[PDB]
Amino acid sequence: DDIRQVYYRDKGISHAKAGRYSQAVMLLEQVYDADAFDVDVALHLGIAYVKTGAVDRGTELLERSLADAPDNVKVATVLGLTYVQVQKYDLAVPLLIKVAEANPINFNVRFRLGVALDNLGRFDEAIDSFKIALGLRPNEGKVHRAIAFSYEQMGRHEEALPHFKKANELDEGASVELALVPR
Ligand SMILES: [Mg+2]
């Protein structure tokens, strides 16, 4: 266990990458060290803790990791998305804002940001994120539906309506209009 410690590190990270998160916890717990901080071990063990229900230990390792490596978009993403999931929206929002700007092709982040903003009552900001998300994925019914709800809350029924109708059209399946549009 310098050699054994390298074995558990590499194997543990391997497991975390693969989604074998229980096993990743069992192995990376043997190598993690708060006071000789290794951000790859802490990030992957943080993820694995969050995925196995140890959300408080996980968000701890991830805050520590993000304090150590403020550049780490991977770390900021899982921490932001985790906070969204546990509904700590005051924490989630600034992380997701910063990740969305660092990584503008990440649709899930932009959507989840818009959903959070909507749930805080920041309907204008939500609408702005949902429009960005639709620019990434124009045929995601769930975004058309989310943005229609935000417009409606602001009394913008005229603007909501086309998005409502699109959401319901996409639920059924294919838009017949595309029969007439060249590719
Ligand atoms: Mg709402």
From Swiss-Prot:
Induction: Constitutively expressed, levels remain the same over 144 hours of growth (at protein level). Part of the probable 18 gene mamAB operon. TPR repeats lie at residues 5-38, 39-72, 73-106, 107-140, 141-174. It comes from the Bacteria. GO terms for biological process: magnetosome assembly. The keyword Membrane applies. Residues 1-71 are annotated as: N-terminal domain (NTD). Coiled coil: none annotated. Disruption phenotype: Takes up less Fe(3+) than wild-type cells, is less responsive to magnetic field, cells have 1-5 magnetosomes (compared to 8-14 in wild-type). Cells have chains of empty vesicles. Magnetosomes are slightly further apart than in wild-type. Deletion of genes mamH to mamV (amb0961 to amb0978) gives cells with no magnetosomes and no magnetic response. Its main location: membrane. Disulfide bonds: none annotated. Keywords: Biomineralization, Magnetosome, Membrane, Repeat, TPR repeat. It is found in: Magnetosome membrane. It is a peripheral membrane protein. Residues 72-176 are annotated as: C-terminal domain (CTD). One of its GO terms (cellular component) is magnetosome. The record marks 9, 38 as: Salt bridge that stabilizes NTD. This bacteria makes up to 20 cubo-octahedral magnetosomes of about 45 nm in diameter which contain membrane-bound crystals of magnetite (Fe(3)O(4)). Expression of just the minimal mamAB gene cluster (amb0961 to amb0978), including this gene, is sufficient to form a minimal magnetosome chain with small magnetite particles. Protein missing TPR1 (residues 1-41) forms an N-terminal domain of TPR 2-3 and a C-terminal domain with TPR 4-6 which can move with respect to each other, hinged at D-71. Oligomerizes into high molecular weight complexes (at least 560 kDa). Forms round, 20 nm diameter complexes with a central cavity. Interacts with full-length Mms6. Probably binds MamC. Belongs to the magnetosome MamA family. Probably forms a large homooligomer on which other magnetosome subunits assemble. Required for formation of functional magnetosomes from pre-existing vesicles, it has a dynamic location in the cell. This is Magnetosome protein MamA. The lineage of its organism: Bacteria, Pseudomonadati, Pseudomonadota, Alphaproteobacteria, Rhodospirillales. The gene is mamA.
